[model samples]
Target: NQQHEKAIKSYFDEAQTQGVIIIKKGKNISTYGNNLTRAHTEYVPASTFKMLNALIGLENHKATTTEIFKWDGKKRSYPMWEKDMTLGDAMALSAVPVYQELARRTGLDLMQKEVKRVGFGNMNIGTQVDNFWLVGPLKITPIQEVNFADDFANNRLPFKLETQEEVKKMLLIKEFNGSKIYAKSGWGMDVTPQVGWLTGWVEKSNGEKVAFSLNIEMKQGMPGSIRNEITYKSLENLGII
Candidate 1:
C-alpha cells in the first residue's frame, strides 16, 4: 500500500497524465493508480502488436529471426526505420513499416485465425489486413496486456515452444540488478490523447517472474519515453525489477 501510493504520486502525478500499472504474479494481481476502471478500458495496441505478429510469423514460417528485411529505399515515419533490419531489430525499434509488411504477408486468414486461437483481446481484426491493431476494431485493456504477458511468459499460448522462445528473446529490454526486463512499447498516434503502452515482465535472478502492463494518456507535452520511465518507477516501487 505504501509503495503503490508513493509510485502513483510520483509517477503519474508528476507526469500530469492519467495512467495505470497492472502486475500479475502467479494468480495474484496488483494495480497502482486510483482509476481502477481505466485498467480495464480497451485501447489500440499500436506497435506492441508486433509481439504477437512475430509469434504468428514464426509459427507459420512467414518470417524467421535471422532473415534480413531489405529496405526499399523509401522514406518512413522514423529515420531508424529507413534501413534494412532483422526481426529482432524491427521489434525493438518499433519499426512500423516492417511489421506492416510482415502482417500483409501473413495474410488475413492466418492472422485472424492465429489471433483468435491466442484469445487476444476481442479477437476482431475487422477488415484491412494490415492496421487493425493500430486503427482499431481490435482492442486490449491494460489488464488484458498483463494476461497476455502471463500467457506469453508461461508458454500457455497455443504456439510452439520454440516459436514462443524466439519471440521472448526479441522482447528483451535490459538487465538490472541481476534481473532481466523484457517489454514492448506502443503509441496509438491515430487517436486523440494518443494512448501509450509498456507491457512485459521482469525475470528476477532468483527465477520469480512478474508480468506487468502500463498505459497512459499521451497528451501534449507527454514524451513517449515517459512510458518506460513511469513503468520502471512503479516496478521499482513494487520491488519487481
Candidate 2:
C-alpha cells in the first residue's frame, strides 16, 4: 500500500510543480497535498456538471437515453458537425450545448433538486431553480466527490431507477473496455485567473468502486493531456483497471 502512496505522491508532486491540483480515492482510502486541495475553493464548474444535468433531464423526462438533439452548428460559430447526437454520444464526448439546452428545457427548479441530491461541493443553489447558478459559480472539493461515489453506489441520488440505468448506459470509457465504470469530469474558472477541475471514479473488475477528485488551479493554455495520461496509468498500476 505504501507503493500506492508513493506513486500517488509522486504524481501529486509533479502536478504541484506544474501548478496543477489532483485528488483521488479508492474504496476507503483518500489522499491529497499542496494547492490541489484548495483549488476548488470557489471555482466555476463547466461541462463537468453535465453528468448531473443529464440525470435531471432524464428523471424529469426532458430527455431520454436515446433522445436526440440536433446540432445547430451556431452556438460558438465553429463549423458544426451538422448531425443529430444521442444523449449517449453527447455525454461520451462531453457536449456543451446539448446539456445547456437540456438544462434550459428542464428549467432551474428541477436542476437544483437533482444537484442538491447529488451533493458535490459547497455549491450555492439558492432558493430558486431556474437561475444561472446551476451552471458555473458552483463549487466542489475532492472529498465531496468521494461522497458522490458513495451516493452513486447506493443509488441515493435524485434520478429514478430507470433514469439512473439510462445514464449508466451512456457512460462508455475505453480504459476498462467491457467493465462498467461510471464517472464525470468538470472544469471551472475564477476571477483570480485560475482554472479548476474535478475527476476520477472507476468501478473495478471485482465490483469494488474506486473514486478520486483532482482539482487543479493553473494558468490558461496548460496541457491537460499529460496529467490525464498520468492519472489513467496510475489507476491501471493500482489495479483499478
Candidate 3:
C-alpha cells in the first residue's frame, strides 16, 4: 500500500479540494488524502445507486435493461425526463426519475430483502420510497464500494450471473489502452460541501482487475465531469489505469 502512496498523493493534493481514493488490487488496499479512513467514512451513494437499482430491478423481474420507462411528463429537474426511455438510457444518463419508477415497481419488501442479503452499506431503506440512497437512512463507504465493485464485476453478488453481467454492462463507461472502465458517478448536491463519487473498476487486456472508489468535496459551480478527471488521474498515479 505504501508503495503507491506518493503517486496517489500527487493526484489528491492537486485536486483543489478534499477527497479520498480507495483502490484495491487483490489484498493490497491504499488510501490517499483526507482524514477519513476508507472503511469508516460513509456517504450517500447518490446516482451510483442507479447502477445497483438497475441490478435489483433486473434480478427481481421488476424490469429489464430494454424495458421502456414511461415518463410521467410533469417536467422534473432534469430535462431528459420529458420523454420515454429504457433502463439502458436511464442508467447511461443516471436519470433519477426512471430509477425511482423502477424502485417503486420493485416495492419495499423485495428491495429490503436483497439489500440485506447483499450486505449493501447499512441496509437501511428508511421510510422513503425513492429517496433512501439519495437523502439517506442508507449509506456506504469507499470500502463498501470497493467491495461492491469487485463482487459486481466477478458475478459474486447474491444474484444470477446473467443479472450481474447485465448490470456491469449497464455500468460500462468506456475503454482505452486495452482496458475497459466501468464506473458510475454520484453527486449529492443537496449536501453541504457536496459529495461527489466515482466508483467501479478497470479490466485490463490480460484479465487483471483493479477495483476502486474515489469521492470528493465539490464546491459550487464545479462540473460533474471533474469526478472522473480526478479519479482517472489517481488511477494513472497509482499506475493501475
Question: Sort by TM-score, best first: what order?
Answer: 1, 3, 2
Higher-scoring candidate on TM-score, 2 or 3: 3
Worst 10 residues of 2 by lDDT: 17-26
Choose 1 or 3, whichever is better by TM-score: 1
Candidate 1 least-lDDT 10 residues:
2-11
- For residues 1-241, what per-residue lDDT tens digits would candidate 1 score against the true structure? 8857765657787888888888898998877864567788999988889999999988998989999999999989878789989989999899888888899889999899989988898898988978899988899999999999988878887899999899999999988989988899999999776999999999898778899998888888778889888888888887776
Of 1 and 3, the candidate ranking higher by lDDT: 1
lDDT of 2 by residue, 1-241 (tens): 6786666557756755422333344346455444444533555555556767777788777877777798776744234434678878877666666776787888767667667666656645555443243344466655565566455554666567777667766664545664455656554443355544445467656666566555555556766554465556566656666
Candidate 2 local lDDT, residue 92: 68
Q: Sorted on lDDT, highest at the top, how do the candidates line up? A: 1, 3, 2
Give the Cα RMSD of candidate 1.
1.3
State the lDDT of candidate 3 residue by residue for 101-220, as single tens digits: 989998888888878888989988877869898888888988888888888767778889899888888778978789999998899876665788998999999988898888888887
In model 1, the Cα lDDT at residue 205 comes to 82
lDDT (C-alpha) at residue 32 in model 1? 80
Best by lDDT: 1
Model 2 reaches what TM-score against the true structure? 0.78
**TM of each candidate vs. truth:** 0.96, 0.78, 0.94
Candidate 3 displacement at residue 216 in angstroms: 1.0
Q: TM-score of model 3 relative to the true fold?
A: 0.94
Count backbone overlaps in model 1.
Answer: 0
